[PDB]
């Protein structure tokens, strides 16, 4: 995936303390990052696709290929199975852990990025726009 790429900044965002809730994080890490507005810095070389969260609260990465299911250290310090697919064009992101899922689609909607949260009955969703 391509049209993915670049650098996008964080507008707007419903409903992700209740997600972040919802997921299990505690409230002091949610405290800190529901008020950041991180940049988001995607790309990629080949079959390896890079994304990069930054803010003052915490830097994150991944790396990963298309569907192979990766280890990830969450922002929250959880540690999860998670498989990153393509699907008519929206980047689904599959994290499992204990048992537990939730699921992250990022989608391209005339010039933002869309990206949609979902764990069990909470839906969250965040919009950035480029830099
Ligand atoms: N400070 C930062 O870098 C930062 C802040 C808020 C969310 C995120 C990334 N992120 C995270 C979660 C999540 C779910 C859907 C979309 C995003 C996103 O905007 O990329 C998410 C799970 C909760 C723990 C925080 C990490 C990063």
Same mark, same amino acid.
């Given at each position: 995936? $391509?049209?993915? /790429?670049?650098?996008? %900044?964080?507008?707007?965002?419903?409903?992700?303390?209740?997600?972040?809730?919802? /997921?299990? =994080?505690?409230?002091?890490?949610?405290?800190?990052?529901?008020?950041?507005?991180?940049?988001? +810095?995607?790309? =990629? @070389?080949? $079959? /390896?696709?890079? +994304?990069?969260?930054?803010?003052?609260? %915490? @830097?994150?990465?991944?790396?990963?290929?298309?569907?192979?299911?990766?280890?990830?250290?969450?922002?929250?310090? !959880?540690? =999860?199975?998670?498989? +990153?697919?393509?699907?008519?064009?929206?980047?689904?992101?599959?994290?499992?852990?204990?048992?537990?899922?939730?699921? +992250?689609? !990022?989608? !391209?909607?005339? $010039?933002?990025?869309?990206?949609?949260?979902?764990?069990?009955?909470?839906?969250?969703?965040?919009?950035?726009?480029?830099?």
């Amino acid at each position: 995936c $391509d049209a993915f /790429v670049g650098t996008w %900044k964080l507008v707007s965002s419903e409903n992700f303390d209740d997600y972040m809730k919802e /997921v299990g =994080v505690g409230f002091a890490t949610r405290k800190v990052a529901g008020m950041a507005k991180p940049n988001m +810095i995607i790309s =990629v @070389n080949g $079959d /390896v696709i890079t +994304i990069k969260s930054e803010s003052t609260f %915490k @830097n994150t990465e991944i790396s990963f290929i298309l569907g192979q299911e990766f280890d990830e250290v969450t922002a929250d310090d !959880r540690k =999860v199975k998670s498989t +990153i697919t393509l699907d008519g064009g929206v980047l689904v992101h599959v994290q499992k852990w204990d048992g537990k899922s939730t699921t +992250i689609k !990022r989608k !391209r909607e005339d $010039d933002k990025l869309v990206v949609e949260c979902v764990m069990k009955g909470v839906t969250s969703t965040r919009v950035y726009e480029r830099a």
